[PDB]
Design a protein around this ligand. Structure first.
Ligand code: LBV
Length: 305
């Protein structure tokens, strides 16, 4: 089973117990956005990232207890209608907020809790190219090139899982001067079993700055349940420190991947690196999620034949 998280007396993770880290409930976020949680009926703000004033203009203890009807009067009715009790936790409400300076708002529901993420914000020929690839290798090449053109990332790989969960870079698009990873293979423990399971359900994750300290969510436990807040559906969730260290030792300042899912199993990842910290813009992320779904469908075809 999972260890308790660090704020419930759990141990710091080592290579002996990688698979036991409760990565879905870190009780903290990355500093390039802000996160609030709120009661799904009242809209009462229950939890606040400690950096909330940087993005929302009010300190955590001032936001606490206010309602989304007061804080987001133009969005609250639409948000309620969009995310009723019992909807899937990957269903999202999205809005673009005007702010004295836009802010992207992304909301999902887990049980009776709304999870609100705030971050700053500012193809057809490509899809046909993916469709037109005549074999799996060519498809992988086209996908990595297309994603690199979209995003500007220094490296874009297609990382394929073997049946023993080892991984291999099977295609890559890379900036001039970088080392090749093409053909290199990696142990199963580099993406441990609980991560692979999370990535079958929540199809995009990232680390915008591999040296940035996490920002606590407080109070850390959901007051509704006196239990940890599930953050697997939040892109702002803090990343495992073991993985952050892996990336720093690779010379990677920013990382992002999108799951490739075939017959309901995790086939691989579109895995991206940048040498310098880098926030992929929100609109570019949404496009990249869509390409992941389209790639997945294409891989299922090409691999059968
Ligand atoms: C004892 C635990 C270890 C461990 C844990 C860990 N790793 C991940 C997530 C990722 N690991 C990745 C690995 C690679 N990226 C590459 O570029 C290459 C090779 C060229 C490898 C082998 C990847 C792609 C991920 C996914 C996330 C990402 O795209 O940045 C997690 C989960 C992270 C999270 O979502 O919070 C964990 C717990 N990794 C180890 O190496 C050992 C130390």
């Amino acid at each position: 089973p999972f260890f308790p998280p660090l704020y419930l007396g759990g141990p710091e993770i080592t290579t002996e117990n990688c698979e036991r880290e409760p990565i879905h409930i870190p009780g903290s976020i990355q500093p390039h956005g802000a996160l609030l949680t709120a009661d799904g009926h009242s809209g009462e703000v229950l939890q606040m990232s400690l950096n909330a004033a940087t993005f929302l203009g009010q300190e955590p203890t001032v936001l606490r207890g206010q309602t989304l009807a007061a804080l987001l009067p133009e969005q609250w009715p639409a948000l309620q209608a969009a995310l009723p009790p019992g909807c899937p936790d990957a269903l999202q409400y999205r809005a673009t907020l005007d702010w004295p300076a836009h802010l992207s708002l992304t909301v999902h529901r887990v049980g009776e809790l709304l999870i609100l993420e705030f971050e700053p914000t500012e193809l057809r020929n490509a899809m046909f190219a993916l469709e037109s690839a005549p074999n799996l290798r060519a498809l992988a090449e086209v996908a990595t090139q297309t994603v690199r053109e979209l995003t500007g990332f220094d490296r874009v790989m297609l990382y394929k899982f073997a049946p023993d969960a080892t991984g291999e870079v099977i295609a890559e698009a890379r900036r001039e001067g970088l080392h090749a990873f093409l053909g290199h293979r990696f142990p199963a423990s580099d993406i441990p079993a609980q991560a692979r399971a999370l990535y079958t359900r929540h199809l995009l994750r990232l680390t915008a700055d591999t040296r940035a300290a996490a920002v606590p969510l407080d109070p850390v436990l959901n007051p509704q349940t006196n239990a940890p807040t599930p953050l697997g559906g939040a892109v702002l969730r803090a990343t495992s420190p073991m993985h952050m260290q892996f990336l720093r030792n690779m010379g990677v300042g920013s990382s992002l991947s999108v799951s490739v899912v075939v017959g309901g199993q995790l086939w691989g990842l579109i895995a991206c690196h940048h040498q310098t910290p880098y926030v992929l813009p929100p609109d570019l992320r949404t496009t990249l999620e869509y390409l992941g779904r389209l790639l997945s469908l294409q891989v299922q075809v090409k691999e059968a034949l």
